[PDB]
Amino acid sequence: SQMSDLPVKVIHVESGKILTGTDAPKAGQLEAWLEMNPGYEVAPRSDSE
């Protein structure tokens, strides 16, 4: 699968809540979700070194 198919987490500044890939929007509809829900930001992954 591609990242575009996998969900991307986000962090809200107005509420401070962090949405996980489970509740967060998909990579394809993320742009629309963020545009509609202002204050959110792409959260970091769980890769690390």
DSSP state of 35: H
Structural domain that includes position 28: 1-49
- Given strand 40-42, what is the order of strands in its sheet? 18-19, 10-12, 40-42
Instruction: Write out the two tokens for 1.
Output: 């699968």
Q: Which of 20, 33, 26, 23 is nearest to 7 (CA)?
A: 26
Q: Which of 17, 7, 4 is nearest to 45 (CA)?
A: 7
What CATH number corresponds to the domain at position 12?
A: 3.40.5.120
Q: φ, ψ for residue 3 (rounded to 5)?
A: -60, -30
Which technique? Answer: NMR
Per the structure block, which two tokens stand in for 17? 């809540």
Number of domains in the chain: 1
Which one, of 4, 8, 12, 13, lies nearest residue 44 by Cα?
Answer: 8
The Cα–Cα gap between 13 and 2 comes to: 28
- CA 31 – CA 29 distance, rounded (Å): 5
